[PDB]
Design a protein around this ligand. Structure first.
Ligand code: SPH
Ligand code: MYR
Ligand code: MYR
Ligand code: MYR
Lengths: 235, 283, 5, 268, 60, 235, 60, 235, 60, 5, 5
């Protein structure tokens, strides 16, 4: 026979391996594909679709439709946050269950730019200017407009173009961040504030909801495949 | 021609702006996602982007073997109230949860199936009596072929069904299967029934399960210890690992958010609260 | 050397 | 356009029917695929198909439902919602096989002083969850298929406990999209939003989608239409506002194979 | 019948290559090449009938 | 030796494998073939040959020559079925034991068009018109000519051309059907009716048999090889 | 002495090929190629002396 | 299958082997290198850097900063050694812990030329001439200038060029020496003497330190990799 | 895809060669070539701003 | 013989 | 085919 010498690794089964193996159904007549609409070639395509953020996970609002609704009102101007969120797309509870968050939980590392889009759902008669902020990590997380202004931000004027987008640019020390809460690879702070105030005329609702969406930019990628914690099988 | 391992686009440097161009304003009612990049809303530098999406291609996302079942067999003397144990399993990816959840990110799929079999044995009773090395027969019984009623009956002849005779303690067994679906793709979801209930027919007669299509979609694996029995009892388990090779997928879906409760999309009371408490203005 | 069918 | 053309103002014409709108938010073509007839290279039943063309590919208007502060959501299945619609329904029940695409036009107007937002989702294979925690996959054909009335979503899962005579219906919980996945992610399915300050309609053009070129329309639904209030209805300070929602849907490029006597289904 | 392709070399110690020969008649027996293509997200991210110009008003 | 690493599958015996192996009788002088008539190259050639259907499997007629005979008579016109059969070529008891049926029981999936040919065996003096029907699945199975007429059919005029063929065209939702009774891949209904009636003169038998045959068309194929249930070996 | 043939590729991830080398002198030791031919059923389905034209009366 | 015959060595694991093996993380997106300063390509580059010798390992001076300081003074001329050291770069206690010594303890064999550089650290006003010697092995180790003069040496005049180097040329019987104390591969003797004396004026320190450094020349190499004795892990 | 390189022959019994074929897609799976380069020690041994001429006074 | 991708 | 270093 050809002289051969068995090397380490011989006879193991690595679940990630990529070998050939005998076919149990030789000469089987395979059914051809047809051109089914909606083919996906890469999971990041799904990460680039906007999905809605469960921002308000209060004890009474979580796991209900209400968790998606951020309530605004026409109260006088304040420099206090409408919402505060950590840029930890796979682990912050408000982001981890979005389609982006979900896909990230099958990977260990993420990188690239993200974008948040807010939809105003008050009446046409309602006007307003809001400030959407991103503060890269390392300082006191913003709790007042004063601090949030100093970081990356978009001042949103409410009007016919119903929605507004703030891009969270990839700003990181490491080349990839971890998909878990980790101080070394922390992402910083997303927050929203009143720039002026919501103003309505008479005969108009004084309170309304805005909805928020997150998706990945074209420079976004993930790596190191892993099992998720978002599903289990006890017994 | 763009490949999965190609680097993603460079960030182009961009300066200050004051114009009627409004990238940041948009309208999600249209159903579209705003295609923005950082240079649309902030000042950027030029960066030469090296990162790629290679590991998240559909193939790379699925390129792992996953456990889909555990089959138990024994090698015991068949006696009037209990026979030697052979195992029977209806092929499916829905008895376990992890591969199921990954496949269900999509509505339909096509792939070649790689099945790897890990086999382990042990003694169950105290006697110091031994056993000799076991050979196992893993028979694939496609829908319609006779299912074994006894560990040693005629069906184990396998003149036409594919069988694997696995020797204990050797490398885990492995075979490949082509795309064998009777449709042009595998349906991870079938919103329908296999029967139409007719009025001129009884309700019982027109009845069928919601969301089930062919009753025995893919057939059965039947596994046995080929050896005759020892004085001592040995129990074995055959763990089956499924990897989808050469895979294509269509129509993306939100992932399973609450615990699986059967082969359908049903959910159990008490499992419906996946999200945890977190205050709106708390980082 | 090689046959090609 | 400098000759007035707008993204918000559309006219759709199919057969002897026209829809106009002056407050659209563009329109969607699911997965970028326009409806088509079955091609010879993908064909499967060999008999000459029936193609009813304008007789069936026209706008049918379903029964109008009502949106209120307490509305949790509505759902319909296709082709089921159209099973009793003129010659489309006739052609459907006379043949074993059928395939069809659709233009779905959801209508809901209000006023500049109302607010609210409907997410309108078209879901391929919209399998919904059942009411039982003692059995799975047991929703009956009759309850799975409401016809044009559709069904509704609920904010609460409530298990059917009558084991003697089980309800055998769906119990589709809204934040779980009626199928055990989170509603916030339903936007990966082809969709539009009717946000009352912005637009008064949604228009979804749906291709035939299936793992087969053609199938039993009577046994199987290809598409589900799910409409859910993403932001609740509100008006001035009325405690009990109401506005109507109307669905008009048109089959497109439908063809049928396997002609025989007509199917008479058990629907109640 | 040998197929020669290049590796994308990550950590380094010209193009490094690797060789592949199929041993079976059935393509189902073959390993995965991982030589896969990418596509634009548009059918999911911009499924609208009228092309979107991002600098322009989305509604006009 | 050449460095090698044993992969999963090593040392198994797959009964469907296709490997080389040493010859136990080296240099054996093989007897050449001769040109024996009747060589077969593919099992579907046998499926294309007409074989006779055991239509009447009544308790007294089954497993006797009588099961092949369908009795007609010169009775007045009725819209009631001469026979009713399910298009389940591998599993309906009347089809499963035909040569087509038999070959199909070694495979899991079948597809393509079929044809039924009926042979009139009454006297030359006997005349008649019959209606042979195929109703694709999904409605009430035909029990009256009225329903059967609406499906695929051939009206057969009895005369010098003794036999008549109805082609059951491939009309299916799936690309292949299962070779077992399965509602999802059901094939529909074959039935035969009197169009006018059998008419005979005097001095003629008033009753006669027709015989039926089934065979596959050239577009017919099977796949996924399997063991049959039509033979066993108890002990 | 290598033989290179093409696979009929069923599910997809140019022509994919596979290689075969015979290791033994006796053809009996060889694997099966599965490169088989088909034939017309006629010797069993139309064994008649006079060619049948299907549009014509079979008996004339 | 291809006939093969397993050779000796089959299935062993040699820790020094160089085989291929399956990747556990296929298609992983690797982070590119960046041009980090200070890349090293060969351990002998580190051996060529001067590191300071712990010459005075007396009981009180060892494992303190003092071990690096060789004390000189302005005393009258003597022919007695300032220091005496064995050329055993990996094993003499004064050399074994230098960077050269350390790297040599990961190898079994060394060869090539070395160099010792001394730094005078007295005041500018201090003058002096010293004699630095290398006596190849085989005779009485030098204890008086008289003997040390007869070997390889440099007479160092102290002045503005603060330091002086003596090259220990590769002079050996064997092609490589052992990195342990071994008489067969002994290297000989390094010693330093007063040539004249240190002279200082008034108001000046009468005592001072010189420091010594060792490094390998460009013709220096090592071989046969081995574990060091300079680290352990008890329990 | 075979790579042929020469051995540096130590004890002897023309150039003797050895052959290498990569069996995997990932460069991480490859053995080490040991075909490595050397560099000058200067960045560590002469890190000074003004080039040193060894025959010259180091300080001038 | 050889394909080169 | 072959590389030669
Ligand atoms: C000797 C071992 C032979 C093993 C042969 C197994 C053949 C059967 C392959 C089964 C294919 C299962 C595919 C997965 C499930 C389906 O995607 C979905 N439930 C819908 O069709
Ligand atoms: C194309 O493959 C021509 C070159 C052949 C190279 C050697 C093949 C190595 C052994 C393959 C054996 C066949 C496997 C069934
Ligand atoms: C034709 O075969 C010429 C090419 C040879 C290619 C390599 C052969 C691989 C090893 C076969 C060993 C011989 C088996 C008896
Ligand atoms: C370049 O490699 C062309 C020559 C091929 C020579 C024979 C290859 C030997 C077997 C390699 C099998 C492939 C390993 C995945």
């Amino acid at each position: 026979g050809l002289p051969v010498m068995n090397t380490p690794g011989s006879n193991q089964y690595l679940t990630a391996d990529n070998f050939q193996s005998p076919c149990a159904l030789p000469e089987f007549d395979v059914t051809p594909p047809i051109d089914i609409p909606g083919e996906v070639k890469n999971m990041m395509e799904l990460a680039e679709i906007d999905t809605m953020i469960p921002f308000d996970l209060s004890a009474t609002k979580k796991n209900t439709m209400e968790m998606y609704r951020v309530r605004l009102s026409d109260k006088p101007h304040t420099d206090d946050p409408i919402l505060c969120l950590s840029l930890s797309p796979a682990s912050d509870p408000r982001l981890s269950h979005t389609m982006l968050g979900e896909i990230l939980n099958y990977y260990t590392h993420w990188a690239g730019s993200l974008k948040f889009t807010f939809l105003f759902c008050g009446s046409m008669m309602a006007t307003g200017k809001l400030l959407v902020s991103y503060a890269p990590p390392g300082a006191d997380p913003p709790k007042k407009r004063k601090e949030a202004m100093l970081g990356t931000h978009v001042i949103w004027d409410i009007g016919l173009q119903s929605s507004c987008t703030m891009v969270v640019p990839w700003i990181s020390n490491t080349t990839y961040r971890q998909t878990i809460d980790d101080s070394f690879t922390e992402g910083g702070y997303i927050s929203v504030f009143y720039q002026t105030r919501i103003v309505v005329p008479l005969s108009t609702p004084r309170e309304m909801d805005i909805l928020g969406f997150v998706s990945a930019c074209n420079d976004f990628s993930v790596r190191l495949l892993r099992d998720t914690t978002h599903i289990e099988q006890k017994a | 021609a763009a490949t999965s391992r190609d680097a993603l686009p460079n960030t182009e440097a961009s300066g200050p702006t004051h114009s009627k161009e409004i990238p940041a304003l948009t309208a999600v009612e249209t159903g579209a996602t705003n295609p923005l990049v950082p240079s649309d809303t902030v000042q950027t530098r030029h960066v030469v982007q090296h990162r790629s999406r290679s590991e998240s291609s559909i193939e790379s996302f699925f390129a792992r073997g996953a456990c889909v079942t555990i089959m138990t067999v024994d090698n015991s003397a068949s006696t009037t109230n209990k026979d030697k144990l052979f195992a029977v399993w209806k092929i499916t990816y829905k008895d376990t949860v992890q591969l199921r959840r990954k496949l269900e990110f999509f509505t339909y799929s096509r792939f070649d199936m790689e099945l790897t079999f890990v086999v382990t044995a042990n003694f169950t009773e105290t006697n110091n009596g031994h056993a000799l090395n076991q050979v196992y027969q893993i028979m694939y019984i496609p829908p319609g072929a006779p299912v074994p009623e006894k560990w040693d009956d005629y069906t184990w002849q396998t003149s036409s069904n594919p069988s694997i005779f696995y020797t204990y303690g050797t490398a885990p067994a492995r075979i490949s299967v082509p795309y064998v679906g009777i449709s042009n793709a595998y349906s991870h979801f079938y919103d329908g029934f296999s029967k139409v209930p007719l009025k001129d027919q009884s309700a019982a007669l027109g009845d069928s399960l919601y969301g089930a299509a062919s009753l025995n979609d893919f057939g059965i694996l039947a596994v046995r210890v080929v050896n005759d029995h020892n004085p001592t009892k040995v129990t074995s388990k055959i763990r089956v690992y499924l990897k989808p090779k050469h895979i294509r997928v269509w129509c993306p879906r939100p992932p399973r958010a609450v615990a699986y409760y059967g082969p359908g999309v049903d959910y159990k009371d008490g499992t419906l609260t996946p999200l945890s408490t977190k205050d709106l203005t708390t980082y | 050397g090689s046959s090609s069918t | 356009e400098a000759c007035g053309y707008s993204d918000r103002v559309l006219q759709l014409t199919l057969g002897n029917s026209t829809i106009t709108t002056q407050e659209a938010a563009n329109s969607v073509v699911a997965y970028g695929r326009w409806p088509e007839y079955l091609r010879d290279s993908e064909a499967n039943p060999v008999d000459q198909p029936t193609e009813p063309d304008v007789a069936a590919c026209r706008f049918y208007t379903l029964d109008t439902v009502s949106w209120t502060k307490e509305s949790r959501g509505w759902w319909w299945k296709l082709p089921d919602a159209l099973r009793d619609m003129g010659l489309f329904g006739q052609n459907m029940y006379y043949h074993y096989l059928g395939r069809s695409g659709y233009t779905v036009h959801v209508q809901c107007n209000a006023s500049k002083f109302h607010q609210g937002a409907l997410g309108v989702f078209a879901v391929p294979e919209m399998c919904l969850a059942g009411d039982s925690n003692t059995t799975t996959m047991h929703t009956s054909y009759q309850n799975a298929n409401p016809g044009e009335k559709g069904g509704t979503f609920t904010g609460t899962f409530t298990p059917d406990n009558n084991q003697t005579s089980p309800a055998r219906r769906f119990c589709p919980v809204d934040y779980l999209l009626g199928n055990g996945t989170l509603l916030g992610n339903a936007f990966v399915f082809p969709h539009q939003i009717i946000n009352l300050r912005t637009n008064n309609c949604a228009t979804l053009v749906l291709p035939y989608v299936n793992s087969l070129s053609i199938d039993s329309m009577v046994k199987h639904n290809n598409w589900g239409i799910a409409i859910l209030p993403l932001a609740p209805l509100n008006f001035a300070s009325e405690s009990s506002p109401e506005i109507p929602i109307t669905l008009t849907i048109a089959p497109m490029c439908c063809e049928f194979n396997g002609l025989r006597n007509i199917t008479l289904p058990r629907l109640q | 019948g040998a197929q020669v392709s290049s590796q994308k070399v990550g950590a380094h110690e010209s193009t490094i290559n690797y060789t592949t020969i199929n041993y079976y008649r059935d393509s189902a027996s073959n390993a995965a090449s991982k030589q896969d293509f990418s596509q634009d997200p548009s059918k999911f991210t911009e499924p609208i009938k009228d092309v979107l110009i991002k600098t322009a008003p989305m509604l006009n």
